[PDB]
Amino acid sequence: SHMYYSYGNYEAFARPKKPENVENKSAYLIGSGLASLAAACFLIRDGQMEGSKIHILEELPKPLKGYVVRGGRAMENHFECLWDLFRSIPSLEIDNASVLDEFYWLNKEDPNYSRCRVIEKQGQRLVTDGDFTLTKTAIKEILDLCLTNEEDLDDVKITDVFSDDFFNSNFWIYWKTMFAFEPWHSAMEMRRYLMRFVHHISGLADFSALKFTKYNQYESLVLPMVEYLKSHGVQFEYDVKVEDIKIDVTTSQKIAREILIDRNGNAESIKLTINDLVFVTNGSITESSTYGDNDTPAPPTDELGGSWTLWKNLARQSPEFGNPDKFCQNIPKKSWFVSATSTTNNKEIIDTIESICKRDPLAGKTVTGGIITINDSAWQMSFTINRQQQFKDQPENEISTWIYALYSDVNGDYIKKPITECSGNEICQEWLYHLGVSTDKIEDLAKHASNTIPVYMPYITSYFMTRAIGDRPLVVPHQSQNLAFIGNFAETERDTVFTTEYSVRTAMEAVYQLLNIDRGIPEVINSPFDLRVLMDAIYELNDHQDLREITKDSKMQKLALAGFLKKIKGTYIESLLKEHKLL
Amino acid sequence: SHMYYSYGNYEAFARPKKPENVENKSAYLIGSGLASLAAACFLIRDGQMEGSKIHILEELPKPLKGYVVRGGRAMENHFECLWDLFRSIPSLEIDNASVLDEFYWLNKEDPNYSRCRVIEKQGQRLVTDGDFTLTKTAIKEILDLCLTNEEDLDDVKITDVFSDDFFNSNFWIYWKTMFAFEPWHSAMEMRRYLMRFVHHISGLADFSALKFTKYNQYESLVLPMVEYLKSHGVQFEYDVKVEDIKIDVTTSQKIAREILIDRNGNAESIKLTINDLVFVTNGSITESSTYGDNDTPAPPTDELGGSWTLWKNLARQSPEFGNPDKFCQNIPKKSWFVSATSTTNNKEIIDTIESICKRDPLAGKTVTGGIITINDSAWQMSFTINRQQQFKDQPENEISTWIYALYSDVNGDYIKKPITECSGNEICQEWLYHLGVSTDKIEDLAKHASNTIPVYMPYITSYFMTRAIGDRPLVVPHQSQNLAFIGNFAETERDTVFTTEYSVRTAMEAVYQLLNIDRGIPEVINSPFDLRVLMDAIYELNDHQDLREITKDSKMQKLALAGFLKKIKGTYIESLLKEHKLL
Ligand SMILES: CCCCCCCC/C=C\CCCCCCCC(=O)O
Ligand SMILES: CCCCCCCC/C=C\CCCCCCCC(=O)O
Ligand SMILES: [K+]
Ligand SMILES: [K+]
Missing domain, CATH: 3.50.50.60 (FAD/NAD(P)-binding domain)
Structure with a gap:
């Protein structure tokens, strides 16, 4: 009022x-x-x-043993x-410019996108990368959640509203890692996210919608x-x-x-x-929050x-x-607790990163474009490298990598310990392993060529x-x-x-x-109510298929669609559907 | 591009x-x-x-015989x-403020609305004023027009797409007079208007959506x-x-x-x-444009x-x-050509205006809140009185009234001549008649107590x-x-x-x-694509009835609605429809 x-x-x-x-x-x-x-x-x-x-x-x-990268969300x-x-x-x-100006111009000069979003098998790009791999069942579960009243989601878990198809999708890999959702987290908040960012669904896999300071x-x-x-x-x-x-x-x-x-x-x-x-x-x-160091x-x-x-x-x-x-x-003790900032000037590590993300980490522009997810890591680890350097007084031959693990109570694949039990150099070793670094060099490059600061945050998933x-x-x-x-x-x-x-x-x-x-507050952007955005979402969610392909293998739907097209033929609704690639 | x-x-x-x-x-x-x-x-x-x-x-x-009010659209x-x-x-x-600031603050200090939108029978308020009086047939014609592709409206007239029900509605009275649409005008442009301003449908009859300098x-x-x-x-x-x-x-x-x-x-x-x-x-x-005077x-x-x-x-x-x-x-020679600005300090005229619009014209705030339409005038005349005075150097005991006629080739009801043949004082006499001024005073009050400047604009409907x-x-x-x-x-x-x-x-x-x-142009506001706005429009267009009343007298619809409500019961769509009064 x-x-x-x-x-x-x-x-x-x-x-x-x-x-x-x-x-x-x-x-x-x-x-x-x-x-x-x-x-x-x-x-x-x-x-x-x-x-x-x-x-x-x-x-x-109005003293940590190395650089630490904080929130850093896009x-x-x-x-x-x-x-x-x-x-x-x-x-x-910049003189006579606002923070917005500097940000706006920067992200036009150097726009963000990922050239490699998911890796596996110690440094291989995921083969289906770029695709949501959602079945019709999973898509209906997404829309059924959005169609549930928030008031009906009290204490409801994400696992309460999705089934196996959804949790096996690439969509869930992209989604859970970029936003740090755990399976036991709030379905109410996941619903808010689905509606809040629906206008950027076409940028979910390649992070083209992300902007960074x-x-x-x-x-x-x-x-x-x-x-x-x-x-x-x-x-x-x-x-x-x-x-x-x-x-x-x-x-x-x-x-x-x-x-x-x-x-x-x-x-x-x-x-x-x-x-x-x-x-x-x-x-x-x-x-x-508590802090470790390369050896603690x-x-x-x-x-x-x-x-x-x-x-x-x-x-x-x-x-x-x-x-x-x-x-x-x-x-839950499996929740995300630990993040680490790994800093190096070592050319072997930096060249390895370059071979995966396809950009020079030291060039001063986008590097990974957001997190890279290691899909087959026991920790469910992801890492990102922003425009370098991220600290004004950091040497120009150094990068700092931010690493986190969604699962805290499970042994790693190379370091056979939960992340909560690992020093900075042990976290870096597990990461280097998943980059594909040769196993006879991992220990040396982590311990002597890098400085990695882990942080334990009891409430980071709160x-x-x-x-x-x-x-x-x-x-x-x-x-x-x-x-x-x-x-x-x-x-x-x-x-x-x-x-x-x-x-x-x-x-x-x-x-x-x-x-x-006496001035208005801007509402949350109206994208979930915008028919044009909702048409784009259907097209993207069905991995770029029109309404005939979507309904092809179901007689019931195949017929309700033919009756719909009969009524709207030659009308503005049909041109709209064609403009948004649904027809 | x-x-x-x-x-x-x-x-x-x-x-x-x-x-x-x-x-x-x-x-x-x-x-x-x-x-x-x-x-x-x-x-x-x-x-x-x-x-x-x-x-x-x-x-x-880098000389007219009196004040002339120009475009003055809201x-x-x-x-x-x-x-x-x-x-x-x-x-x-105002010091250290923009034009927007002054406008924004003014229209919050003195917000616009009409207390009398349509009069008839020489000064009586129209009885159904405030209501659209649209039949279901007329409403379907409105929506059918919006559902037509613009490309299919080449050279199509407004009379080509609407029938008797629509042209008998109060909606058409409000619409044609506030926007100056003639029946032979572009259906394409009328469609653009319907879509462009749909977010203000609840302010169409009382002009609550209008803002003025x-x-x-x-x-x-x-x-x-x-x-x-x-x-x-x-x-x-x-x-x-x-x-x-x-x-x-x-x-x-x-x-x-x-x-x-x-x-x-x-x-x-x-x-x-x-x-x-x-x-x-x-x-x-x-x-x-050409100009007359009180006698020409x-x-x-x-x-x-x-x-x-x-x-x-x-x-x-x-x-x-x-x-x-x-x-x-x-x-067409029937088109709107003539507007007139009638200026007076005469208390009989001003008191007559006060008795119709319910506000003191000399108070310096909203007066008519936009045009008053004389529904039964042969000329189809409307007139408005903005916040007075509209000219910085005008005496504080004067008002200036802007008058226009949609029909230019038809005899008036009191002055039995087309408006194009009338002096300023004759236009003012026809107007005073429709205000209910006593017929034994009209001539004197127009000729000696007012100064009225007519303008002939060959292209005003262009x-x-x-x-x-x-x-x-x-x-x-x-x-x-x-x-x-x-x-x-x-x-x-x-x-x-x-x-x-x-x-x-x-x-x-x-x-x-x-x-x-390298900066975005704001799109035309997205209101015709916003489901919330479209729900409000259905509710307002059906003069504030929910989906059951709307469909009550049609079995076919009454049943398609029951099937719709069955599918959406207990969902977010139902709460949305209830929030926007459709359920
Ligand atoms: C009724 C509404 C239906 C909603 C459809 C749900 C689909 C949502 C799709 C995912 C949005 C992806 C968001 C990725 C953009 C980055 C987020 C950010 O900008 O911070
Ligand atoms: C598909 C879209 C359906 C559109 C429904 C059409 C109904 C439009 C209703 C009338 C809008 C009334 C505009 C009055 C506000 C004043 C205009 C102005 O601000 O200048
Ligand atoms: K604002
Ligand atoms: K802009």
Whole structure:
């Protein structure tokens, strides 16, 4: 009621009037991740809140044994809120240009695509690569899922809605690895993904729809925002651990009253009035991460960190604040936990990568174009090499490779141990084996020619845990006066979590609602409602067959189609179907 | 091939790289209407062409007996190209705001809607006002038209595709008068309108979808653009009549070589190279306009002016440059020709208007909210009163009313003459009669208390003449190197003419194509392909009935619906249909 959804250029280009009474308001942002930063940016730009009244509370202060590549997930053109934000953030690389400009021009200069998406048998390209290999049964299961109401998917697993045909498809290889879905994850979220990205189905196998920043996410997204916020006087408070927020939850209002913090070791409290807004990033996929090195595994852990402890403390004050235990408890021990960043200047390794991905990793352009999946790896390992180098101060003869394994409790094929028990050099050895490197060189090249840093992340799969409506708090809970939840464990319609777009969307919706900003929020792109996109999807999903080939081997369908074509012959519907290759 | 269509914020907010070799190029814009001005703006902003190399050639120089209101057509939110343009044009009314900002804020401060759309019997509101009164037969004719391929509508009249039920509907009253469609006009263009604006069907009767500038179009749109262009050094050349452009049309290229002009009376020629771009606004609805006064009719005329003569001279050089005679010849003598602007400070007239439209005309906010149609007027007359005053220097106790008649060859009900034979005061008398003013006061109030300026426009209905594909030139004809056609007689996909959006779209497409600008053009809004919008349309078109009421009185349908509901029961399709009130 305190916001509305829109689309089109009118609302995109319009500027909101200064919101009412904002001169008497303040904001506290809990956490320093992308959602907090984006919310602060919207407070400055569209709330016209004074930067000095904006307080970002970060647990970290103002030494790892090598380079580590973080989230690094791709974006797409229809990250509608994220581009609304980053058109206003100055680039740190190009004069008089925004982050969006630099990104837009870069991905036109050097457009992303994969020349080798799946390998097997120690370095062979998969033979059916490029094809979805979906049977009619699997396709009907996909569409049956989209045709299920989200409300009917409470706690439903991906394995509850798909059968053997689907799980044997190339589609499932592409899908599970690029998005990091496990079979026991949320069918509700998988449905959101299917609908959310249907306009890019023709780019699923070759990653032609992916777009990437010039450098790692921190240098290309976080640092530009931080510079923008600091230039506007926003206050960054470091070594602040937020332990609880006392919230009054009455029959008529929800009002945050006090932030209980541990500053640099000392218990303190921030008293809030109704004009002091609090933005909580509830939960975190990176909390309690541990780090290994070339010779040491990352020590597994089950610690609840400060992020999960805080959400638990808020949930104790109202069921409307969500159910953190659905996301941070009972995570299967087979789940993805470990990622590794393997850095080398060794020509044997780099030349091996070149022979598989067909591009020079040191040229400074696209290399793998996104992850390469090792389809027959016991770990279900994938790895990617982005445009090199991904760190501004890294030597120009080095590459850094990011590696992850979807299965954490199964022996590797060359290193006969679960990934959670492997040092950096052992992870690199298993990877080199699957590249086809000669087995008499693997040990030396991993131990002495590379430096590999593993990271153990207990909650990295947490976004996708099976959930019920109500497990995630509304961005602005009902009757909340000065409290919002942002980030990928907050609830909003149809958008997909594990994306930076979701972080920016929740940030924008929280700020606009709490300040009653008179401007539209862009809806999640309308592609699942667009007949043209749905026609393309049928054509692509059936691996480029028209309606006659699709129905050929079924009399019942073969006849319903002939009756359909009779009615639409010579009409606009027939020309549309022909334009989208269905006729 | 030299442009691409896009939608969403990514392409909206992105800035194009400077196009290649633009530093060696020039532009000549023929005419000073909105399309020429918009093209010049895009040349500056996105072509990064130097303003000194941009030459606008206007026939007019750098005295009417009263105020005259011109085009004054409304806009809507999904004028996608127009808002792309006017976000970059500084407002002349508000500091540090664009034209878009001022427009956006104004129409939120004072949103448009009609409190009385149709009157009859000398000032009575129409009883069924607000309802479409469409029969099932008429609705199927509407959808059958949309389901016809545009290519099958060559030279087809509106009367060729609709029957008595449709022409007796309130829908047709609303539609024909707000858009100025005549029964003999283009069914192809009517189809484009139905598809183009389907997202606003719920605002058709009460004009809630309409948005208006603060002042008349010249003060609120043209003058801001002119100031922008002059501030960038763009050259305005006045008293230049362009008589012909010599174009080389070879087997491989189309190249404009020479502009033949009459400057201030003297024959001259502008020599063009391939790097000199020429933008022709072919044809004009305002050419050869004549003016009357309170005591004199506007003299009818059939003169081809300079605009139509120029298009004819170009068409003689290639059929690819269009067929002007389809639009400027054989216009029926019943067509709309006359509009009048009636200005008064008289309290009897203003109070009469207040009693019909329910708002104070002098308050400075919406008055009629768009045209009021006099349904039983022999002339088929409508009139509107915008926010007053529409001219910045007009006295604050005056209103100006705009009046037009769809039928030009039929005696009025009070003044027993065709409108083409009427003085300004006689047009005002016929109007006052239909307002219900007492017949013993009409003559005095028209002659002495009002000043009414009639305008005769031979080509005002020209955009809508029946046409065939090929009658309008492509914005950039095939193989054209330096020549483009812009404005509402140029050809582009799915957009609707007689709109300022069409002028800006053709301008943008011409500039982007001729300069090969590397940025997307926003497509015509995708509403006819959006299932949600199509569901709303069925609900509104059937005057707010669900699928069971719609089908109730037909056994055949009543059964196909029961079979449909059986298949979709409990699915996402059913929830969608319920959300859009069809179930
Ligand atoms: C009713 C709707 C039917 C939906 C059909 C479902 C098919 C979805 C197809 C897969 C989308 C592939 C997405 C790959 C693009 C990369 C994602 C990204 O941009 O981040
Ligand atoms: C296949 C598509 C079916 C199309 C259904 C057609 C019904 C169209 C309904 C009328 C649209 C009314 C437009 C009124 C809004 C004002 C126009 C404007 O904004 O300038
Ligand atoms: K917006
Ligand atoms: K654009």
